[PDB]
């Protein structure tokens, strides 16, 4: 008939497919024995197919597994942890540095920290000095610190990340530092990246001494960063 027939046979084709378990490889035991860890819990020993290029299966990689036989199926790239996805490709477009005015001295000092070492890396080498890593903005409210960040964000759009610095905490003893692990591991994978940590004073602060067990987790998130 019309496309209702062709959609139906692809619909019945798709149902015969099954899922696959996601796990990580610890080490290579022999040429056909591989020890893996399913991420939900228990670890196993498995085998490859025959042609999965076993030199590529390095310790620490992520890989798929079958259900019944539980063998190695296909290697995959590193996970992205979709909390990190919500803060990566989420910013709408902004107009350039024309709207911000009166801060042209502070505009150029941020440009020399961020844009200049990646656009022109040779000139720092010629002097022979490592470029600075990060910068801090501060002042009275309503003078445009966040708008200044929006100006840098819609400038090259390299790998801009927007940290709310209040969703870093969670209800468990873990999962706060573990998100910071996956954020910087996402920063290592995509090399020219920019992290923006707005309102650090929530997560940050001073060092207490026997304050509260609640403050111990907020500190444990702090000195990990």
């Amino acid at each position: 008939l019309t496309k209702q027939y062709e959609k139906s046979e692809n619909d019945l084709k798709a149902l015969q497919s099954v899922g696959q378990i996601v796990g990580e490889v610890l080490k290579q035991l022999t040429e056909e024995k591989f020890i893996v860890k399913a991420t939900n819990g228990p670890r196993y020993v498995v085998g490859c197919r025959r042609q999965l290029d076993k030199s590529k299966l390095k310790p620490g990689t992520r890989v798929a597994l079958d259900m019944t036989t539980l063998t190695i199926m296909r290697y995959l790239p590193r996970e992205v942890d979709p909390l990190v996805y919500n803060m990566s490709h989420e910013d709408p477009g902004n107009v350039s540095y024309s709207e911000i005015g009166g801060l042209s001295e502070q505009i150029r000092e941020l440009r020399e920290v961020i844009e200049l070492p990646l656009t022109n890396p040779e000139l720092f080498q010629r002097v022979g000095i490592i470029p600075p890593k990060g910068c801090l903005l501060y002042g009275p409210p309503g003078t445009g610190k966040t708008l200044l960040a929006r100006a840098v964000a819609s400038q090259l759009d390299c790998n801009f990340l927007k940290v709310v610095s209040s969703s870093i905490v969670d209800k468990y003893i873990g999962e706060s530092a573990r998100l910071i692990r996956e954020m910087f591991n996402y920063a290592r994978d995509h090399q020219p990246c920019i992290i923006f940590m707005d309102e650090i004073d929530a997560i940050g602060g001073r060092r207490f001494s026997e304050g509260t067990s609640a403050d111990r987790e907020i500190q444990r998130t702090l000195m990990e960063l």
Binding site: K33, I35, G41, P42, R43, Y44, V45, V46, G47, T69, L70, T71
Partner: peptide, 25 residues
């Protein structure tokens, strides 16, 4: 065979029979 789970041996009770702690929990 090949699909074996992985555990940690703990103590030995008698000959060819001992306790073991599975990583399943």
């Amino acid at each position: 065979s090949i699909p074996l789970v992985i555990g940690q041996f703990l103590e030995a009770v008698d000959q060819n029979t001992a306790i073991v702690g599975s990583t399943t929990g």
